[PDB]
Amino acid sequence: TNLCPFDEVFNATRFASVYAWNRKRISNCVADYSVLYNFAPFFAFKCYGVSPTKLNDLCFTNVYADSFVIRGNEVSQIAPGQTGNIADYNYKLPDDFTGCVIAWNSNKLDSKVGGNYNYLYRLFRKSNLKPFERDISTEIYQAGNKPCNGVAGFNCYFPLRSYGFRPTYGVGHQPYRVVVLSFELLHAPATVCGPKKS
Amino acid sequence: STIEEQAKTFLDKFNHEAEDLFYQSSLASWNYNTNITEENVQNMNNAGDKWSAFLKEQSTLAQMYPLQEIQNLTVKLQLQALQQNGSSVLSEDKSKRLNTILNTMSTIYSTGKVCNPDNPQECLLLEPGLNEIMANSLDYNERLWAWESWRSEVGKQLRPLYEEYVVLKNEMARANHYEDYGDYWRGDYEVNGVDGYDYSRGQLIEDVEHTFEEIKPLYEHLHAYVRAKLMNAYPSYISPIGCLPAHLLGDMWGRFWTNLYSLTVPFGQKPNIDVTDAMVDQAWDAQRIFKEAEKFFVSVGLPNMTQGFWENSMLTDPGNVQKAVCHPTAWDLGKGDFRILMCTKVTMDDFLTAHHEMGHIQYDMAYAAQPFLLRNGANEGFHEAVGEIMSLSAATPKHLKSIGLLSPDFQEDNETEINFLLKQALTIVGTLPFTYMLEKWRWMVFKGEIPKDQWMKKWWEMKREIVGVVEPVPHDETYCDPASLFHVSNDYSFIRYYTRTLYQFQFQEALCQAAKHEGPLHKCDISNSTEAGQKLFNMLRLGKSEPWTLALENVVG
Numbered sequence A: 001t002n003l004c005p006f007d008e009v010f011n012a013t014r015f016a017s018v019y020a021w022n023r024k025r026i027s028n029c030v031a032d033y034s035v036l037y038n039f040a041p042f043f044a045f046k047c048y049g050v051s052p053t054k055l056n057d058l059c060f061t062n063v064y065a066d067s068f069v070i071r072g073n074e075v076s077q078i079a080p081g082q083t084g085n086i087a088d089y090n091y092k093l094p095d096d097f098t099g100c101v102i103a104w105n106s107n108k109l110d111s112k113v114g115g116n117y118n119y120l121y122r123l124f125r126k127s128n129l130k131p132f133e134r135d136i137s138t139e140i141y142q143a144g145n146k147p148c149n150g151v152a153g154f155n156c157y158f159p160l161r162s163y164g165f166r167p168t169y170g171v172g173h174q175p176y177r178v179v180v181l182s183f184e185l186l187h188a189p190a191t192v193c194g195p196k197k198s
Numbered sequence B: 001s002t003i004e005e006q007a008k009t010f011l012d013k014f015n016h017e018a019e020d021l022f023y024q025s026s027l028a029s030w031n032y033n034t035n036i037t038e039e040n041v042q043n044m045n046n047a048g049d050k051w052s053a054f055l056k057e058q059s060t061l062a063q064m065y066p067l068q069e070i071q072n073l074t075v076k077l078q079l080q081a082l083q084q085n086g087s088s089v090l091s092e093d094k095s096k097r098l099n100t101i102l103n104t105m106s107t108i109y110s111t112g113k114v115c116n117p118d119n120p121q122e123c124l125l126l127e128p129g130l131n132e133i134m135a136n137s138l139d140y141n142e143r144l145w146a147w148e149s150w151r152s153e154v155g156k157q158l159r160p161l162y163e164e165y166v167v168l169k170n171e172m173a174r175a176n177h178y179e180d181y182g183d184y185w186r187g188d189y190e191v192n193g194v195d196g197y198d199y200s201r202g203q204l205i206e207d208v209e210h211t212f213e214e215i216k217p218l219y220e221h222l223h224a225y226v227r228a229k230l231m232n233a234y235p236s237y238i239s240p241i242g243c244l245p246a247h248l249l250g251d252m253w254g255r256f257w258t259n260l261y262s263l264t265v266p267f268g269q270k271p272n273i274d275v276t277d278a279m280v281d282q283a284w285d286a287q288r289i290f291k292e293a294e295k296f297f298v299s300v301g302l303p304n305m306t307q308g309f310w311e312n313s314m315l316t317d318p319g320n321v322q323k324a325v326c327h328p329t330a331w332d333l334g335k336g337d338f339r340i341l342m343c344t345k346v347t348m349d350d351f352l353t354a355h356h357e358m359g360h361i362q363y364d365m366a367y368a369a370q371p372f373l374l375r376n377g378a379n380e381g382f383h384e385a386v387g388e389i390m391s392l393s394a395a396t397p398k399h400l401k402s403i404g405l406l407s408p409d410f411q412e413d414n415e416t417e418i419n420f421l422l423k424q425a426l427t428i429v430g431t432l433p434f435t436y437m438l439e440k441w442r443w444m445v446f447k448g449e450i451p452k453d454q455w456m457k458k459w460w461e462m463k464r465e466i467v468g469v470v471e472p473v474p475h476d477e478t479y480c481d482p483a484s485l486f487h488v489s490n491d492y493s494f495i496r497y498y499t500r501t502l503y504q505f506q507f508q509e510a511l512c513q514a515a516k517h518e519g520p521l522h523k524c525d526i527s528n529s530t531e532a533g534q535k536l537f538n539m540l541r542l543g544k545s546e547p548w549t550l551a552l553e554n555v556v557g
């Protein structure tokens, strides 16, 4: 039986930024949640819709795995009903969320002496994001009332900045890999879900 | 989007970029300080110049948001900290001349030499060798020689430079609407627009002079006692109703009287508490000291160390060849990087310096959630006071005998208590008249109330009157005796040592009552009491967010 390819979205040697987060849809297969739950300390593992224990008797049409990397003290923003530079301009979760979230520390992986400027995030935007909206535009954010014609300068700034990750940071300023699962049941009669013992 | 939201958007970008650049510069400076090489010098200088340039650029960019229509006091605080021109209001010629005289004065002070009158090939510097004579010697003639020659051979070189330094600094200050350099300096205690906690820049003088008036009855009795005890070490040289000659005081200036303890000890046959051998006999190392300090800080309800503190800190002297500046400091590199740099031995004084420095580290950990510009003490005297109360509390016999460094019984006596209190008063009290008088002279000189042909006259008049010490040799207007002190020729304000000394004790008295102390105050130990930890943490976490008069109220009342 074709198992769920959770071994890739969790072992991805290179993760995606938060302003451009990765999203993988898992098709009709058998879902093994017992490969990750027994796996590791998992500094963050919060489940809202279903209880974390009974993932092996309920089924859903398709599941999405969204993957990115954020700072340590921003993991609290990945939750329905949160505000902040991440929950407003980079990644939003609807209040009726049915999936869950998990995050862990990756200081020994995504941090290098001298600065790892390959991880970006957006801190300027005209309006808030909508649930599960993804924005990759690189237009120069205009703060004042005068147009700035696509150049940086006074009252017009570049909208994206970088996490200068380094190994000599404190827990909370270190890189954390976040994977959020999202369930769905529109109308499908027989879908992907967990295995039974025979 | 009127003018205020633009300021907020500007401050966000400033915070991010400045945080990154500051981390880089601080990491470079740490790397240099813990491992002295040649490459490290320029490696740190590059980041330093980059940071300074970024700061100047942002400062000039920040002038475009006027201060008048900003309503948020936090945003106004940050913008006002970032908008201050400082120097660079002068011309280019004038600014370069100012930097030249600053460096000249510093280099004169650092490498000045005096030598024997009977063997002119024996010149001594100040640091290793003149203020060793002044600290240890008991020869009236040798002390007089050192005291006179330092001021006569090096002090006279700084007079024409100081006269120019005054003028240039006054111009730089008046070009920022300040009336003089003294007012520019006093501008650190000023508060505006809080309606209950305001504080003017000219009120500081009044508070200082009104608090000093209540210390004179104690300083007079200490002065009389020290004079009576010095009349036995230098008979026929002190008069039993006059001042004290200025060269017999314990160091080159008389800033602390702490070196007159051997002459003026009350009960010389009772050695005071010194748990040093009890530490080596129990096999104490540099890590046990800091573990005990951390346990003490957790006892009152404050957090642990950051667990990066144990890996990146240099708690011991690097052995083979890793030359480092062995000067104990607390580093706040940013982004959650707190470290301690000290070459600890196994003694009692290092056992106290550990607590003093971890106090700084705890203050830094407290306000790490504030915007970058608002990470500092409420004013210039809060940080060292918070540092000092920890060493105050951790050196009491009640704490030492609970750690295990004293015998479990150790009956104390009042004679040892008097010994201890006098050793403390020779340092804490003996330096308040000196500090007050020096900063008063400098204020009056910057203001113009002393014409430049009466500098030394007024200096020694105020020394005879306020401090109570007299010069052994007359000094005309070719000298500059103030400029022969580090803080005067290296351009540092001196009132932060007067106010801190006060705040410190206030804090202690407010923390002794929360812990329900009973006996005298000098026997307090705030350990094992979480209410004191809470009263302290309510002020530690503010930084400069609130005016200092409010933060002080959150502890003292």
Ligand SMILES: *[C@@H]1O[C@H](CO)[C@@H](O[C@@H]2O[C@H](CO)[C@@H](O)[C@H](O)[C@H]2NC(C)=O)[C@H](O)[C@H]1NC(C)=O
Binding pocket: A007, A011
């Ligand atoms: C994630 O990837 C790592 C590395 O590719 C996997 O580590 C492997 O572990 C197995 C069993 O312990 C070893 O036989 C391999 O040699 C390891 N790989 C390497 C490159 O040394 C790890 O198992 C992966 N995680 C999961 C859940 O599959």
Ligand SMILES: *[C@@H]1O[C@H](CO)[C@@H](O[C@@H]2O[C@H](CO)[C@@H](O)[C@H](O)[C@H]2NC(C)=O)[C@H](O)[C@H]1NC(C)=O
Binding pocket: B035, B037, B039, B040, B322
């Ligand atoms: C102290 O600094 C010096 C000079 O920067 C370091 O010396 C060299 O550092 C390079 C850096 O990679 C090494 O590759 C060399 O092997 C070092 N040579 C020697 C003779 O030390 C030195 O390593 C630094 N000390 C510490 C403890 O980091």
Ligand SMILES: *[C@@H]1O[C@H](CO)[C@@H](O[C@@H]2O[C@H](CO)[C@@H](O)[C@H](O)[C@H]2NC(C)=O)[C@H](O)[C@H]1NC(C)=O
Binding pocket: B008, B072, B073, B074, B075
């Ligand atoms: C402008 O002032 C308001 C209050 O005068 C600040 O509002 C505070 O915001 C912080 C976080 O942004 C909260 O923790 C506080 O609880 C808020 N206070 C109140 C009374 O609501 C606001 O932060 C200020 N602007 C900026 C940019 O800091």
Ligand SMILES: *[C@@H]1O[C@H](CO)[C@@H](O[C@@H]2O[C@H](CO)[C@@H](O)[C@H](O)[C@H]2NC(C)=O)[C@H](O)[C@H]1NC(C)=O
Binding pocket: B063, B083, B084, B085, B088, B089, B176
């Ligand atoms: C800081 O210094 C500048 C000159 O270097 C002062 O002059 C103002 O500078 C701004 C910015 O270019 C101009 O818009 C004004 O027209 C200048 N003149 C004024 C305001 O009279 C500036 O005032 C100084 N700022 C402070 C706070 O002292």
Ligand SMILES: *[C@@H]1O[C@H](CO)[C@@H](O[C@@H]2O[C@H](CO)[C@@H](O)[C@H](O)[C@H]2NC(C)=O)[C@H](O)[C@H]1NC(C)=O
Binding pocket: B414, B415, B418
């Ligand atoms: C330390 O305490 C002792 C005991 O209370 C003091 O000794 C007494 O002092 C009073 C005051 O002069 C005398 O009347 C008693 O006669 C003393 N007792 C004896 C047994 O002689 C001592 O004076 C105190 N010393 C200090 C410096 O406080």
Ligand SMILES: *[C@@H]1O[C@H](CO)[C@@H](O[C@@H]2O[C@H](CO)[C@@H](O)[C@H](O)[C@H]2NC(C)=O)[C@H](O)[C@H]1NC(C)=O
Binding pocket: B398, B399, B402, B527, B528
């Ligand atoms: C702070 O309180 C703790 C807990 O009571 C004290 O530790 C105990 O002290 C008693 C008295 O000597 C000992 O009998 C116990 O063995 C200690 N237990 C532990 C776990 O240490 C501690 O001595 C107190 N510290 C101060 C300075 O009062």
Ligand SMILES: *[C@@H]1O[C@H](CO)[C@@H](O)[C@H](O)[C@H]1NC(C)=O
Binding pocket: B298, B302, B303, B304
């Ligand atoms: C501090 O660390 C020690 C381990 O050394 C642990 O036992 C204790 O619970 C910690 N306390 C806090 C407040 O972190």
Ligand SMILES: [Zn+2]
Binding pocket: B356, B360, B383, B384, B387
């Ligand atoms: Zn200190």
